[PDB]
């Protein structure tokens, strides 16, 4: 209904809103729109021992939203955290998805089930089961351009030729892997072939950045004068 204000709002207050926006859009199966908000939330908020709670929960939600895309957080995130001994089931989520192993995942959300369920993040960890396969098939698209259907079934431990073919097609409906199946010759072909500076798209990519720089140009001019009316009216020697 778009009625949130922005006039009297605060560092905490806007950080809080965004966190609600994250949580709604992720569980509604759109992780691009969810991730937009969570990044904003950490950003507004101060960084203190009194903000610790807010930051702590923001980090927890962030990892999973990102994992759901099939894109992975870096190891330095967790390592240099002072908040790392509560992000330990979350670190294992990162490793397990990436390495594509079905059985590690199984163990992780069973071992750390109370932890995940306390914090309410256990429901998004269920859809991260799917991402184990999806992330493993992705690595394979990067590493191999032409690969038999057979070799793929051994790598992720799947039964039939048929099984891999159902999984891959769905995964490239989303566009995560970036391939096309050739069951006319029995191999999968990787379709990423770049040539993006030879497309017409780059003008369009710059136009959004230019538009953000115009946004700061306005925000600077209007902000600056607002204390200054009062200040010239204020008594002085």
């Amino acid at each position: 209904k778009l009625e949130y204000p922005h006039t009297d709002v605060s560092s905490s207050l806007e950080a809080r809103y965004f966190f609600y926006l994250s949580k709604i859009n992720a569980i509604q199966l759109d992780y691009s729109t969810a991730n937009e908000y969570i990044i904003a939330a950490i950003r507004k908020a101060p960084h203190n021992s009194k903000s610790l709670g807010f930051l702590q929960q923001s980090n927890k939600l962030h990892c999973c939203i990102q994992l759901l895309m099939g894109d992975i957080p870096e190891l330095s995130f967790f390592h240099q955290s002072n908040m790392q001994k509560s992000l330990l089931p979350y670190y294992h989520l990162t490793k397990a998805v990436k390495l594509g192993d079905l059985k590690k995942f199984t163990s992780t959300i069973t071992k750390y089930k109370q932890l995940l369920l306390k914090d309410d993040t256990y429901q998004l960890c269920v859809r991260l089961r799917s991402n184990v396969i999806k992330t493993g098939i992705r690595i394979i698209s990067l590493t191999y351009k032409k690969i038999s259907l057979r070799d793929i079934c051994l790598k992720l431990n799947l039964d039939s030729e048929q099984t891999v073919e159902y999984m891959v097609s769905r995964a490239i409906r989303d566009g995560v892997i970036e391939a096309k199946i050739n069951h006319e010759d029995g191999f999968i072909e990787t379709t990423e072939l770049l040539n993006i500076y030879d497309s017409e798209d780059p003008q369009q990519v710059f136009d959004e950045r230019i538009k953000f720089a115009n946004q700061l140009h306005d925000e600077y001019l209007v902000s600056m004068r607002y204390p200054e009316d009062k200040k010239t009216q204020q008594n002085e020697k």
Binding site: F206, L216, H217, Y220, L221, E228, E236
Partner: protein
């Protein structure tokens, strides 16, 4: 005669003095006036330095019946040689707003008077054309399309203004307008781009109607105008050639330079914001210091 006379440089005096001749004789409503144009010649660049009326008379019964006075012409040449040794006969202006076929006959008089092909200068003083206030024409003889004879014709040349030093000084001074086009800031050239587009279309329109009229209303087929259009079409960029494809890539690259340049000004602005939020901080300190000081001055009166 003379062959070299290719570009015509036109002082800002010339357009204004012809304008003044028309309206100071009370020849109006297409009673034409013929005056001479004097200057230098015998060379590619043709300077018209000065211009003056001559006596002329015109008939509306047959239009190829007129008076031109030769005796005044002789006296003018004698007088003005002393004024400047840079005025000799270079042709004659015709006051316009249009070219006549009767100006073809009047031309044979000026061709006799001076050994060069004489410039015909149209000075449009009624200004119904948005461009061309001056048109330059030198009558020449050439053999003419469609099996036809050596005919007398007027061939258009460049009619340029470049101005004299002398002239520039009065021109800018009188000026107090922001000019039709000057091509200074970005504001002037954004106007200009849109003006140019209307410009391209207006010329092109007349051409549509010429081709229509050859095949419907039987004006004679002149192969020079058809040939120029061939040349137009062979310098027309074709999409999907390597030339056109390059244009697209270059647009990305110039817009990368612009993207960065817009961000490099946010930096300049960001410096200001901080300097003003510092200024405001000092005004605060000043204000408190006075409010304390009123007490000290209140106390001094009780004290003494």
């Amino acid at each position: 005669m003379s062959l070299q006379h290719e570009k015509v440089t036109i002082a800002p005096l010339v357009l204004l003095s012809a304008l003044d001749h028309y309206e100071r004789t009370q020849t109006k409503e297409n009673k034409r006036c013929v005056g001479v144009i004097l200057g230098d010649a015998n060379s590619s660049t043709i300077r018209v330095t000065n211009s003056f009326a001559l006596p002329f008379e015109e008939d509306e019964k047959n239009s190829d019946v007129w008076f031109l006075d030769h005796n005044y012409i002789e006296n003018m040449n004698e007088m003005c040689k002393k004024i400047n040794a840079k005025e000799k006969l270079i042709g004659w202006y015709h006051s316009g707003p249009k070219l006549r076929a009767s100006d073809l006959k009047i031309n044979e008089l000026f061709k006799k008077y001076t050994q060069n092909n004489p410039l015909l200068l149209i000075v449009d003083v009624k200004q119904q054309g948005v461009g061309l206030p001056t048109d330059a024409y030198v009558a020449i003889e050439q053999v003419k399309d469609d099996g036809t004879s050596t005919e007398k014709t007027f061939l258009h040349l460049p009619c340029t203004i470049e101005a004299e030093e002398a002239e520039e000084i009065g021109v800018e001074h009188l000026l107090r307008d922001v000019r039709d086009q000057a091509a200074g800031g970005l504001s002037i050239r954004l106007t200009n781009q849109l003006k140019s587009l209307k410009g391209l279309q207006s010329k092109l329109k007349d051409v549509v109607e010429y081709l229509d009229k050859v095949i419907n209303k039987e004006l004679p087929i002149n192969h020079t105008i058809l040939g120029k259009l061939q040349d137009v079409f062979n310098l027309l960029p074709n999409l999907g050639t390597p030339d056109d494809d390059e244009i697209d890539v270059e647009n990305h690259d110039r817009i990368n330079i612009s993207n960065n340049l817009q961000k490099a000004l946010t930096v300049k602005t960001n410096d200001e914001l901080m300097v003003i939020y510092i200024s405001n901080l000092v005004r605060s300190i000043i204000a408190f210091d006075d409010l304390i000081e009123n007490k000290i001055q209140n106390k001094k009166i009780q004290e003494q």
